Amino acid sequence: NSFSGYLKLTDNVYIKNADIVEEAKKVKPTVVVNAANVYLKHGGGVAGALNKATNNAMQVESDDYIATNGPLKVGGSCVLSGHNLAKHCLHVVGPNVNKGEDIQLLKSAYENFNQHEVLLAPLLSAGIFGADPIHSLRVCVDTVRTNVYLAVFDKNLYDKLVSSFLEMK
């Protein structure tokens, strides 16, 4: 039970070099955040790792939701089951700047976290979404007021995030 091994960046933002799936299985948090696309297709990265850990139950539930909803908006979210990982999964769509989606929508994406007391989360709009990860962490720190536990799988990205956050003091 309980989050451990996090570096406290602000009063409400914590960060750890860890697999978000391993964190969820250890802690069983109320909310785990998925780094989603508008169609909630959980093919790769965080989304793939979460869906795999649910043995595809997350994808089947996502497909049912999108059939009633249509695609999410960029900057938008939905609350679905956290299945065996968490009580809830908050699927959030950050902007993909590779497709010329507006970086400002990254503010809208993180704003969704404020509807949840505590979240286990990845960094939004990094990897294939092509946003500057150091900017993403700044938007998170400036936008989120609830407790967020950031799980960053890649050691090199984690070290870059932590040392750039400390160097700006």
Ligand SMILES: N#C[C@@]1(c2ccc3c(N)ncnn23)O[C@H](CO)[C@@H](O)[C@H]1O
């Ligand atoms: N680091 C990292 C990643 C990632 C991929 C897979 C995982 C995982 N299993 N746990 C946590 N993080 N994680 O999260 C960010 C999401 O935009 C990107 O930088 C990804 O590369």
